[PDB]
Structures are given as C-alpha cells and as structure tokens.
Design an enzyme around this catalytic site. Structure first.
Site, short mmCIF file in Angstrom:
data_model
loop_
_atom_site.label_atom_id
_atom_site.label_comp_id
_atom_site.label_asym_id
_atom_site.label_seq_id
_atom_site.Cartn_x
_atom_site.Cartn_y
_atom_site.Cartn_z
N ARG A 75 -13.82 11.04 -9.44
CA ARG A 75 -14.71 11.37 -8.35
C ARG A 75 -15.29 9.84 -7.88
NH1 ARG A 75 -18.41 8.79 -11.35
NH2 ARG A 75 -18.75 9.43 -13.55
N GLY A 76 -16.11 9.77 -6.93
CA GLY A 76 -17.12 8.77 -6.35
C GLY A 76 -18.05 8.21 -7.59
N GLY A 77 -18.48 6.97 -7.37
CA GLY A 77 -19.46 6.36 -8.26
C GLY A 77 -18.86 5.70 -9.69
N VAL A 79 -19.97 4.88 -13.75
CA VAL A 79 -20.30 5.84 -14.90
C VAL A 79 -21.47 6.66 -14.90
CG1 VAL A 79 -22.03 4.07 -15.95
CG2 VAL A 79 -20.58 5.18 -17.60
N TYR A 81 -23.47 10.35 -17.46
CA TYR A 81 -23.57 10.99 -18.52
C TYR A 81 -23.86 12.20 -18.33
CZ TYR A 81 -26.54 13.19 -22.45
OH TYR A 81 -26.80 14.22 -23.34
N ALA A 139 -27.54 12.84 -10.08
CA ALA A 139 -26.35 12.08 -9.81
C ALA A 139 -25.43 13.00 -8.88
CB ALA A 139 -25.66 11.72 -10.96
N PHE A 153 -22.33 17.45 -8.65
CA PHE A 153 -23.81 17.02 -8.98
C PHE A 153 -24.25 17.14 -10.36
CE2 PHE A 153 -24.64 21.27 -7.27
CZ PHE A 153 -25.58 21.93 -8.02
N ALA A 154 -25.07 16.31 -10.75
CA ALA A 154 -25.85 16.51 -12.02
C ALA A 154 -27.19 16.52 -11.88
CB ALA A 154 -25.03 15.69 -12.99
N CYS A 170 -23.39 -0.10 -12.14
CA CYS A 170 -23.01 -1.31 -11.40
C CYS A 170 -23.76 -0.83 -10.05
CB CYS A 170 -22.01 -1.72 -11.47
SG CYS A 170 -21.58 -3.35 -10.57
C1 LIG Z 1 -20.77 15.64 -11.55
C2 LIG Z 1 -21.56 14.56 -10.98
C3 LIG Z 1 -21.24 13.20 -11.35
C4 LIG Z 1 -21.94 12.22 -10.57
C5 LIG Z 1 -21.58 10.62 -10.96
C6 LIG Z 1 -22.27 9.70 -10.22
C7 LIG Z 1 -22.05 8.22 -10.82
C8 LIG Z 1 -22.83 7.10 -9.71
O1 LIG Z 1 -23.61 7.57 -8.68
O2 LIG Z 1 -22.41 5.83 -9.97
#
Ligand SMILES: CCCCCCCC(=O)O
EC number: 2.3.1.181
Length: 210
Positions: A75-77, A79, A81, A139, A153-154, A170
C-alpha cells in the site's frame, strides 16, 4: 448500484490480508460487487511502499517481543499501526485508473463521519489521511491491481494512541494522532462507528449498501 459490506470483527492481519486478496480476485473477475470490509486487527505495525528502517524506533525484533505483529506491504504511505479500537476499512472497489479520485472519496466519507460527531475534519492540502487540526484521525493508504483497490483506511475510534509513539513517520505531516474517543472524552461504540462509515460510503459513492 450497490456495494457489499462485510463486518469481519477482530481478525489477525495475515489472515485478513489473505481474505483481502481472495475478495479482490472475485471483484476483478466481476463475480462479486464492490466490497467494503470493516474490521479490527490485533496490534500490528505495517510498512508500505515508502517505508524504510528509519520508520521503526526500535529493531523489528523489539516489536515482536513486545506484542506487535509486523509486516511489509504494498500500500501507499510508510509506517502505520493498527490495533483494537481502530476501525480498519478495506474498500475493494473497481476504481480503474482513477486512484486519486478514489482517495478523495475515502477522505470525503471519513470527513462526513467526523461531522456526524460534531467534529470538523479535513484531508488537508498537504498530508495524506484525514486530520482534526494538527492530529491525524484516520490514516489512508491503498493499493490498486488490475483496476481494483485493496488496503484502505484506518479510523481511530477507541485506539490506544500511545502505541503510535514507537513508530516514526517520514515526510510531511502534522504533529500527532487522535481518535474519536480522545476528541469526545469517552469511548464510541465500534458498531456505531461502522454504521456511520457505511452510511458515509453510501452517500459519497452513490451506492446502496447490502
Ligand atoms: C489501512 C490503512 C493504512 C494507512 C497507512 C498510511 C501510512 C502513511 O500515511 O504514511
């Protein structure tokens, strides 16, 4: 015209991931409607496309010794939790080429959910996810394969926000993290948060939930 909602309850990250992939295959094949999975995970750290070792404060081994699972994902992004009290949603939707639009729609749905609680949230011009002031409420990080999305999403509902302190994002970001519980001063029932998310998705995407 419709999307399917599946509430998986509490599911280990690895098994839930396998399930995402099976659902994804069915949607790609046109044998399942667009599907929104709603669930929680036991404590887990995931590291996406932009993640490096710099995103972990301690060595990977510390996390596993101290009650986290840990996985590298596509996935994008960077780290993030997940843990009990965090509403994880995986919209496995036939988005085609328009991934930026899809992200904006997830953002809009979460903004609507927050507004339902009297909370003013925004995507922000500069930071991924949905924010309330300087703190990240939800997130967002997705992957798209064969024109169908996964991950998602979370949303922090009753999350133990203290668990975010051990990981080190970061790039461009605000200052902290927040949850509906923190903003409202009390726990919010997970069943209700799920219902509000379903309604918001239905409105934003213009689809009937089944
Ligand atoms: C299931 C959602 C996961 C979101 C990870 C976002 C990490 C970031 O924004 O760097």
């Amino acid at each position: 015209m419709e999307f399917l909602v599946e509430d998986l309850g509490l599911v280990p990250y690895g098994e839930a991931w396998a399930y995402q992939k099976r659902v994804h295959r069915e949607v790609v094949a046109g044998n399942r409607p667009p599907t929104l999975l709603l669930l929680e995970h036991p404590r887990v750290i995931t590291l996406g496309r932009k993640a490096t070792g710099e995103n972990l404060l301690f060595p990977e081994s510390w996390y596993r010794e101290n009650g986290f699972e840990l996985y590298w994902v596509e996935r994008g992004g960077d780290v993030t939790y997940h843990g009990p009290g965090q509403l994880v949603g995986y919209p496995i939707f036939p988005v085609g080429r328009e991934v930026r639009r899809f992200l904006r729609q997830i953002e809009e749905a979460i903004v609507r959910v927050a507004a339902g609680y009297g909370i003013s949230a925004y995507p922000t011009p500069g930071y991924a996810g949905v924010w309330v002031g300087e703190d990240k409420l939800c997130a967002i990080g997705v992957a798209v394969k064969e024109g169908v999305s996964f991950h998602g999403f979370a949303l922090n509902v009753n999350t133990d926000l203290n668990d975010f302190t051990v990981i080190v994002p970061c790039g461009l970001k605000g200052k902290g993290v927040t949850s509906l519980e923190k903003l409202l001063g009390r726990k919010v029932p997970m069943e209700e948060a799920k219902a509000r998310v379903v309604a918001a998705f239905a409105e934003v995407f213009g689809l009937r939930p089944v």
